[PDB]
Structure 1
Amino acid sequence: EDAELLVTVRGGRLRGIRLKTPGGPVSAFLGIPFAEPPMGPRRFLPPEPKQPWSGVVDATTFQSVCYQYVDTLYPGFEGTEMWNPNRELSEDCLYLNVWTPYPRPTSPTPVLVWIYGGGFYSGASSLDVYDGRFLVQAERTVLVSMNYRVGAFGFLALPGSREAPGNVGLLDQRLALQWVQENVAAFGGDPTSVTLFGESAGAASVGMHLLSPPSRGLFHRAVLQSGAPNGPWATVGMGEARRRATQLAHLVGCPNDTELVACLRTRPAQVLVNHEWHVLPQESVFRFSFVPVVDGDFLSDTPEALINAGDFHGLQVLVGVVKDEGSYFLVYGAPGFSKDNESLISRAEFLAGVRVGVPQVSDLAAEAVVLHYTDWLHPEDPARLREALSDVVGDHNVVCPVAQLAGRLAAQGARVYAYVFEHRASTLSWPLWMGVPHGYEIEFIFGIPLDPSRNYTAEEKIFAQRLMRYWANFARTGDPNEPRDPQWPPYTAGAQQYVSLDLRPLEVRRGLRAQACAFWNRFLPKLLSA
């Protein structure tokens, strides 16, 4: 038997599995329980630490995916399916995975912790695109990823109530981070060097852990990919959380918070999922029903406020976006869009599209969006309208919240690095008009192109290797840069420098869509407040 694959953690003994990569083997421990199954009376409640077990837990395979909506927009299409659950759905889903070099490191190795995105309504650590084996082999880190509750199960909130306090999916993440502090050394990992990285809702999660003091002692550096806690989709107010929870109860035949939650607890998980999208107040894209709530507890204030008022000396952060953040979302609700045509929309469709991309703002606010995003020498040109609406959704939801986060953090003591990821995968099956869509840098960060059984080019493999080195350098030192030879400069509120990530050497540029983001970050709030 293989002693490298036997580990004892606080709760008992584990058996892992040896995995192959083109660079040699790696040790994997998959499906380690970190909480009691949040089932029955535990639905909607904070996670409880997993009670110790006797005998040996089989950690050789991924565990169940937390209950979630399954994307059926284009049935069979690889582009949507690669994000869907690839294991059975269950509420018994609170497991985490550890990948480590082979044989296990016998000295403290820097730890990367992955938090997946999926708008807080979906995602899983078991997805192919999140395979930790290549990063661990190539960069000799320890990699941890956890499942956390999503949708109503993780984020349904009746603020003030004990039966559904909200944010429990965030607590699932915190408990996993505490698990890492207590157990990662048993795998060769160094609990004093833990870097969080996440994408979209995962990035927003990372940011929220930054702004919540009980989490802040569980890690040392942060990476936010295409997401930020201050995104207009990433939190919801107490009032609206209560309304959405109340409408869900109504839609599934339930009626006093105690009674309401008790009736919800009797419903099959799938039933809650089937009505999830229906509690959204207006037609939209890039909006999700059950998200982190600002209730004074996990988040003592809005992330915007907490950001603006924070002291971030001692912090290093890596943040960035893809080239076309908004394009992907247009096919889920914008009139005139399809992955199967050029989506060359009309001015009228563009105008309707704006209310969908920017839901629940006043007509005046919408008018201001149309003003900024119209080229008044070509107001009706379909291609420009397509690009512009992509820009609206992308700037509003991702780029400008990330820019604002980066500016405030840098101006308040943090060292920030910024990137735009500008390579379109040769294997990408979404149409060319989408450019580089949301989510499509991840496979490169994880070194998926190194997988011989996939169709990436030789250059793409080298690129993935560069990216893995940047990310792991950052985890190790707080600085992505290799030894001098073009350098990646820190982002600051003034110079606003970032690099382009693609097949070409690093290129330094200025401004994360500064003109557009001045509108979203500086002007538009003032307008709304009047």
Structure 2
Amino acid sequence: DAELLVTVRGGRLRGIRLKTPGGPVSAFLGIPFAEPPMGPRRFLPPEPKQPWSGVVDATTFQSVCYQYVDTLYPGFEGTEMWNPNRELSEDCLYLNVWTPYPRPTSPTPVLVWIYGGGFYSGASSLDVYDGRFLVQAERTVLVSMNYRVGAFGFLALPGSREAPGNVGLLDQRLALQWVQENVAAFGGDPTSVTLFGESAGAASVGMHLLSPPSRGLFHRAVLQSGAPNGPWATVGMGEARRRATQLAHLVGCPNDTELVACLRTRPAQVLVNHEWHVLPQESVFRFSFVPVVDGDFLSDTPEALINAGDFHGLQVLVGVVKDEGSYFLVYGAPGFSKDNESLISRAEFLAGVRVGVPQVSDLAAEAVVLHYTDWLHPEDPARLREALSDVVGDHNVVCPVAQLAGRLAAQGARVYAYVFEHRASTLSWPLWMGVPHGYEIEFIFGIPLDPSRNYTAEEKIFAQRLMRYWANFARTGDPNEPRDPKAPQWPPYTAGAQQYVSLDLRPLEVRRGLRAQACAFWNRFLPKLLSAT
């Protein structure tokens, strides 16, 4: 019909009508927002997509940016749900727009979703990122982009104009500029753009908070299980150049301009096959090509920008899942597998500490062991497994988020914190993993409402609940319903009270302290210990 044809600043589009149990949604999938970054444009910042003739087939997702594919458990849904579902291509800078079927007459707020994957993987075309239910239920405009991952998005030879780094973040920013100029044609309100992302997508959201050229592109932010001040999310110029030159050596390509020009001659798959080989040691929850602290996108380290920053006028929604680092362990930690109880020995535990906490002195590992050992049950395998699951989760996700939330709130921002702790009825991972990293996204996106999936009807109510929390934050900067002050109130997170909410099948429950005892070790004591040994 006529609702599926819209015209943006670059040309004409033809969308597709998507069906929801509660009605239809208008979807425009695979809108080009950048000229294909190929050949000489590899490793380079993106160029805005020049105008085109005719109409663009916007009825299906475009290609996935080149990335490593998980093959640890072949055919296992717990891993396959994150693998690409389209063909790999460097011609992948495309975005998507969902909008309610009766296109909103009044400007409706906009959610922009930035995906995770340790800056090495991810695609907006994944099924758990389907935004038809989130739009049909709450009547907002949802936008999701693809950004270059791996060396294609974050390889950096700092200083050189040919490999400047952070171009995957610049892909996101260009997509945000596109929203400022074109979301109005879909009913979106360019004055109510709320960024929300998970894992590296959440860390990416934190980057745009600390980057002035991005700050005028969105108004509020949601950081799900990720923060830019995490140990995995940023790398120094010295190590970034070390990892890039190590890749050029492994691929046969060893000044700076000579190095990059050779790398552009290698097929994209050839670089992907040597990605994990540039890491400085055997580790878990570490990724090769991540944003670099270079002085452009980030004037300083994310930690420094966070402390000295003024965040008045900012509303932030942050949170974690119950068991963040559980499934990371099966990717290199001794004695761990998704297929047994992973009841590890203490020798395996002490060895696993060095894998979860790499590039760290022997004394600091002793400090980690002292805090996470039950010295009445130092050998109990079950306690030891949960301990290492806490070591990885707290060090990489929880304590980075708690450090950011306290700093933002105590420096002008209005922060709301959560802990998603509902294990899905469909979860294919083992039971000892609990609620693993990334398994709140299905409910945030209202995937339970899909009839073809056998979520419990009580889980569908849970999904619609969470969808309202997010939409309420997007509209007002407050997740609470101003309609119903009888329902349990979600209080703001503060540096002192440290109040947060538990999200599960039960009604809201206010808890205090976001692992406050453990995160005092990671954020306060451990830096002093490394700075003195």
Whether these two folds match at TM > 0.5 is yes
Who is 1:510 aligned against?
512
Q: Give the Cα separation in 2 of the matches to 1:483 and 1:414.
A: 20
Q: CA deviation at 1:483?
A: 3.4
Q: Give the Cα separation in 2 of the matches to 1:151 and 1:492.
A: 36
Note the 1:117-132 alignment, pairs <5 A. Answer: 117-132=116-131
Tell me the secondary structure at the aligned position of residue 66 of structure 1: coil
Alignment deviations for residues 356-413 of structure 1 (CA, whole Å, 9 cap, x no partner): 0001111111110001000101101000000000000000000000000000000001
Alignment deviations for residues 453-510 of structure 1 (CA, whole Å, 9 cap, x no partner): 1010010000000000000000000000013650000000000000000000000000
Q: Give the Cα separation in 2 of the matches to 1:295 and 1:96.
A: 27
Alignment deviations for residues 395-454 of structure 1 (CA, whole Å, 9 cap, x no partner): 000000000000000000100000000100000000000000000000000000000010
Q: Give the Cα separation in 2 of the matches to 1:29 and 1:107.
A: 19
Q: Give the Cα separation in 1 of the matches to 2:457 and 2:77.
A: 22
Gaps of 5+ in 1: none
Q: CA deviation at 1:71?
A: 0.4
Tell me the secondary structure at the aligned position of residue 311 of structure 1: coil
Q: Give the Cα separation in 1 of the matches to 2:530 and 2:90.
A: 40
Who is 1:522 aligned against?
524
Of stretches 313-322 and 2-11 in structure 1, the one that deviates more from structure 2 is 2-11
Q: Give the Cα separation in 2 of the matches to 1:161 and 1:434.
A: 44
Q: Give the Cα separation in 2 of the matches to 1:364 and 1:325.
A: 25
Q: Give the Cα separation in 1 of the matches to 2:12 and 2:418.
A: 41
Tell me the secondary structure at the aligned position of residue 41 of structure 1: helix
Q: Give the Cα separation in 1 of the matches to 2:60 and 2:2.
A: 18
Q: Give the Cα separation in 2 of the matches to 1:484 and 1:376.
A: 50
Alignment deviations for residues 209-250 of structure 1 (CA, whole Å, 9 cap, x no partner): 000000000000000000000010000000000000000000
Alignment deviations for residues 99-158 of structure 1 (CA, whole Å, 9 cap, x no partner): 000021121010000000000000000000000000000000000000000000000000
Tell me the secondary structure at the aligned position of residue 285 of structure 1: coil
Tell me the secondary structure at the aligned position of residue 4 of structure 1: coil
Alignment deviations for residues 272-304 of structure 1 (CA, whole Å, 9 cap, x no partner): 000000000100000000000000110000000
Q: Give the Cα separation in 2 of the matches to 1:211 and 1:328.
A: 30
Tell me the secondary structure at the aligned position of residue 90 of structure 1: coil
Q: Give the Cα separation in 1 of the matches to 2:234 and 2:70.
A: 22
Q: Give the Cα separation in 2 of the matches to 1:459 and 1:280.
A: 44
Match of 2:491 among 470, 489, 492: 489
Q: How many residues align?
A: 529
Moved over 3 A (4+): none
Q: Give the Cα separation in 2 of the matches to 1:12 and 1:97.
A: 15
Q: Give the Cα separation in 1 of the matches to 2:208 and 2:10.
A: 25
Q: Give the Cα separation in 2 of the matches to 1:304 and 1:328.
A: 27
Q: Give the Cα separation in 2 of the matches to 1:51 and 1:352.
A: 53
* Root-mean-square deviation over aligned CA pairs: 0.5
Who is 1:341 aligned against?
340
Tell me the secondary structure at the aligned position of residue 320 of structure 1: strand
Who is 1:371 aligned against?
370
Tell me the secondary structure at the aligned position of residue 243 of structure 1: helix
Who is 1:407 aligned against?
406
Note the 1:106-255 alignment, pairs <5 A. Answer: 106-255=105-254
Alignment deviations for residues 13-55 of structure 1 (CA, whole Å, 9 cap, x no partner): 1010001000100000000000000000000000000000011
Who is 2:262 aligned against?
263
Q: Give the Cα separation in 2 of the matches to 1:252 and 1:110.
A: 46
Q: Give the Cα separation in 2 of the matches to 1:346 and 1:461.
A: 40
Q: Give the Cα separation in 1 of the matches to 2:25 and 2:509.
A: 34
Q: Give the Cα separation in 2 of the matches to 1:483 and 1:243.
A: 52
Percent identity between matched residues is 100
Tell me the secondary structure at the aligned position of residue 109 of structure 2: strand
Note the 1:430-445 alignment, pairs <5 A. Answer: 430-445=429-444
Query: Normalization by structure 1: what TM-score?
Result: 0.99
Q: Give the Cα separation in 1 of the matches to 2:436 and 2:482.
A: 31
